[PDB]
Design a binder for this molecule. Structure first.
Ligand SMILES: NC(=O)c1ccc[n+]([C@@H]2O[C@H](COP(=O)([O-])OP(=O)(O)OC[C@H]3O[C@@H](n4cnc5c(N)ncnc54)[C@H](O)[C@@H]3O)[C@@H](O)[C@H]2O)c1
Ligand SMILES: *C(=O)CCCCCCCCCCCCC
Ligand SMILES: [Zn+2]
Lengths: 300, 7
């Protein structure tokens, strides 16, 4: 619980040296909707482009409602119709997804905790072992009837959403809901069991494309030991303690006089990942994987 | 029971 400083410099270059030191064996990524905007899935809270800014159409009390469970229970048709608007024709993971692939392939990834539901991390080749889908996934779907709970795969869910048929179980004619965690719902047990263990021995926390304002996911940054360096790759800074909430009974500290282990690289996640890869000597490796994988997906 | 919520 001492706040010793393990980076030689609070910069990307500092992080890159640390990552190739003996001190850096186990990396945890925490990622959010920002890593998937370049794959054509909009984030929620961006101005102009974010989802909440584009839900005039659905007769909603606050645009937040479309992802709230109590609303979904009353009227599920809006969520399905939105799911139709957003569902990509092609699922192509981004440079940043592939960056995490490289982490896994080099034995550095202890886990990716993701707020995304879009399966892109699996398509880039992170297995269920490497991955904690904290808000669940579109990957599978289940009948909501406690006595049934039949599982359906995405091709079935997709056909129902592109059909504009409100998806209904073939065994019982109950609603079939994608295995995502709505607002108001409990996170999956795997989330809690993983965090109780992995933050005991993490050496680096890589935070990409998240506002860190959805809880309990956001609390993950405080779970790390106090000397674990934390790098944020994001369009804007996030996770710093609010001045007022703060005053009542640790957040990211990039800039105060007290700063010792948090680094903010601000821009496109795709660029930050490329920048970090270049420093690590991985740039060719990342360019080739991304191109090979996109070509592969493009010829399906 | 810790639930999914903004804060
Ligand atoms: N793709 C999806 O699965 C998806 C889409 C929308 C919302 N959601 C979920 O709704 C909630 C919204 O949370 P969140 O924090 O992940 O998203 P958010 O909308 O709350 O914020 C995402 C963050 O990423 C930043 N950002 C956006 N595009 C970026 C880019 N190209 N490069 C770098 N940074 C970028 C934004 O500035 C913001 O700081 C979460 O539960 C989220 O995962 C998921
Ligand atoms: C908590 O994070 C709730 C928000 C998650 C639901 C929004 C997902 C965006 C819609 C994309 C669906 C198509 C992708 C397969
Ligand atoms: Zn059923």
């Amino acid at each position: 619980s001492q706040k010793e400083r393990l980076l030689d410099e609070l910069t990307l270059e500092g992080v890159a040296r640390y990552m190739q030191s003996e001190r850096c064996r186990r990396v945890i990524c925490l990622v959010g909707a920002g890593i998937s905007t370049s794959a054509g899935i909009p984030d929620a809270r961006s101005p102009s482009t974010g989802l909440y800014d584009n839900l005039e159409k659905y007769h909603l009390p606050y645009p937040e409602a479309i992802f709230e469970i109590s609303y979904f229970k009353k009227h599920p048709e809006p969520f399905f119709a939105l799911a139709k608007e957003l569902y990509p024709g092609q699922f192509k993971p981004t440079i940043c997804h592939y960056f995490m692939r490289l982490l896994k392939d080099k034995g550095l990834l202890l886990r990716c905790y993701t707020q995304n539901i879009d399966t892109l991390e699996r398509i880039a080749g992170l297995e269920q072992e490497d991955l904690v889908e904290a808000h669940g996934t579109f990957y599978t779907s289940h009948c909501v009837s406690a006595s049934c709970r039949h599982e359906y795969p995405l091709s079935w869910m997709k056909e129902k959403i592109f059909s504009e048929v409100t998806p209904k179980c073939e065994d019982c004619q109950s609603l079939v809901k994608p295995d995502i965690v709505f607002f108001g719902e409990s996170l999956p047990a795997r989330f809690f069991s993983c965090m109780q263990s992995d933050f005991l021995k993490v050496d680096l926390l890589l935070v990409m494309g998240t506002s860190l304002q959805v809880q309990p996911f956001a609390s993950l940054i405080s779970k790390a030991p106090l000397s674990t360096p934390r790098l944020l790759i994001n369009k804007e800074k996030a996770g710093q303690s609010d001045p007022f909430l703060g005053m009542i009974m640790g957040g990211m500290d990039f800039d105060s006089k007290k700063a010792y282990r948090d680094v903010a690289w601000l821009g496109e996640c795709d660029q930050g990942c490329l920048a970090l890869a270049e420093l690590l000597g991985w740039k060719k490796e990342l360019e080739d994987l991304v191109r090979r994988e996109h070509a592969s997906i493009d010829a399906q | 029971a810790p639930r999914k919520q903004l804060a």
